Design a protein around this ligand. Sequence first.
Ligand SMILES: *[C@@H]1O[C@H](CO)[C@@H](O[C@@H]2O[C@H](CO)[C@@H](O[C@@H]3O[C@H](CO)[C@@H](O)[C@H](O)[C@@H]3O)[C@H](O)[C@H]2NC(C)=O)[C@H](O)[C@H]1NC(C)=O
Ligand SMILES: *[C@@H]1O[C@H](CO)[C@@H](O[C@@H]2O[C@H](CO)[C@@H](O)[C@H](O)[C@H]2NC(C)=O)[C@H](O)[C@H]1NC(C)=O
Ligand SMILES: *[C@@H]1O[C@H](CO)[C@@H](O[C@@H]2O[C@H](CO)[C@@H](O)[C@H](O)[C@H]2NC(C)=O)[C@H](O)[C@H]1NC(C)=O
Length: 419
Amino acid sequence: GSPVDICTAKPRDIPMNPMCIYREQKIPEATNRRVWELSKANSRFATTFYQHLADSKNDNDNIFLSPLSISTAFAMTKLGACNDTLQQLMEVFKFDTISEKTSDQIHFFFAKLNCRLYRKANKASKLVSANRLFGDKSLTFNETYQDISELVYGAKLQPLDFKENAEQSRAAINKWVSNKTEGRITDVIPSEAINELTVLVLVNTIYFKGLWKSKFSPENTRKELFYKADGESCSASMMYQEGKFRYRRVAEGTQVLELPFKGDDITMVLILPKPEKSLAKVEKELTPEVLQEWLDELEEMMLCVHMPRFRIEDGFSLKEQLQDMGLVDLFSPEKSKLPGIVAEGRDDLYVSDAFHKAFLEVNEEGSEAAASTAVVIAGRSLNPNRVCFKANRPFLVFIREVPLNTIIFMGRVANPCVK
Ligand SMILES: *[C@@H]1O[C@H](CO)[C@@H](O[C@@H]2O[C@H](CO)[C@@H](O[C@@H]3O[C@H](CO)[C@@H](O)[C@H](O)[C@@H]3O)[C@H](O)[C@H]2NC(C)=O)[C@H](O)[C@H]1NC(C)=O
Ligand SMILES: *[C@@H]1O[C@H](CO)[C@@H](O[C@@H]2O[C@H](CO)[C@@H](O)[C@H](O)[C@H]2NC(C)=O)[C@H](O)[C@H]1NC(C)=O
Ligand SMILES: *[C@@H]1O[C@H](CO)[C@@H](O[C@@H]2O[C@H](CO)[C@@H](O)[C@H](O)[C@H]2NC(C)=O)[C@H](O)[C@H]1NC(C)=O
């Protein structure tokens, strides 16, 4: 190619100029100060956004998003944003809660994170991204932007004929995502979500395929009762397994359990509150630092584990939620301001809509693995010598990249029962 591999390259190289500027804390040994802060930022938007979304939903619904996906997709947007259609971004995404050093070169450090993130040991531990911008052809996009994107995020903007071929462009965008996601994330943008009036469109999804470092034996899976919040219970395929796992019983009996994937770089963390206590309180108590304290406190332990098969997922229309959180100008044709993408080809450029889509399907094998069918037996005698961690009541769920300490996925399994 022409430029230098961004991953190895430092800031003292690759001239990155954003048309608009916005200008100890015990960090673990062997850590990139800059990346670490940036992450500290994403995890804030994470819990924040999760809680806000959780209020809108009902304690009996499953939840699932990818804070990293969105933080990433919108960072792109802000590559060429300005004024309020920038301050808001920075504020909403917590980028203004880190050093001016990091808060400045956010695209650089996001590039670095993406580097340690999407490279690979491509074992049974894969992680594919699919974030992209779609704007109408009837506009000339700043090529500076275009280049920087491709290098930092690697996608550049994409012009589609919205004004004359919406349903065709819809299929275009759709057939792009149902690609990067190995024909798995299908129908990102729904019909009538894009019309001849669509200006700028934002899509963003993350896909994770992986196998448990310590799989469950299908012969141990069983039909047991999962008690929902509304007091009513239901049958679920409870998976069983006994081994040493990082565990931690925190405040008020809430248990934290970590199950790593082949590689130990990606893991699923469960936050399970005791039978009586409500997940709602825990969710409200959730702060980036609390989660961190819990993670560090973890200690390998020999335990008995009951976890059920399940699939949580959700196609998001962030526009609503985000602005409701304070992200306004960007979605407003009048107030927006993205001089970084278009000077003013056909006037006011703004994000018509933003589409999210993430899903998790766990079983004996791993995430997005080989499902089984062997008729699930019933009943389960009590394990002698020891009780047991049982996710037979609403629990939290986080899919994290450990080295980079980044929350890739977060959700709630409030009801995993027979679909
Ligand atoms: C296409 O968009 C890019 C940004 O997305 C534009 O980048 C230009 O980069 C230069 C780098 O030097 C900026 O210079 C300014 O320097 C002063 C120094 O006092 C600083 O205070 C400013 O914050 C800024 O870094 C420049 O502002 C920025 N765009 C401009 C000229 O405003 C690029 O110029 C765009 N190209 C086109 C054809 O519009
Ligand atoms: C960002 O905001 C600043 C201040 O709110 C803008 O600066 C003013 O822009 C108006 C044009 O609407 C000029 O008439 C003023 O002279 C500018 N400064 C003053 C004296 O208020 C700035 O233009 C905005 N950036 C853009 C163009 O997006
Ligand atoms: C996603 O769809 C397929 C993945 O199943 C990709 O396959 C390529 O398809 C294009 C035509 O769209 C061919 O020119 C390539 O030769 C195919 N193989 C390659 C090089 O990957 C396709 O590129 C992806 N993109 C889209 C828009 O569907």
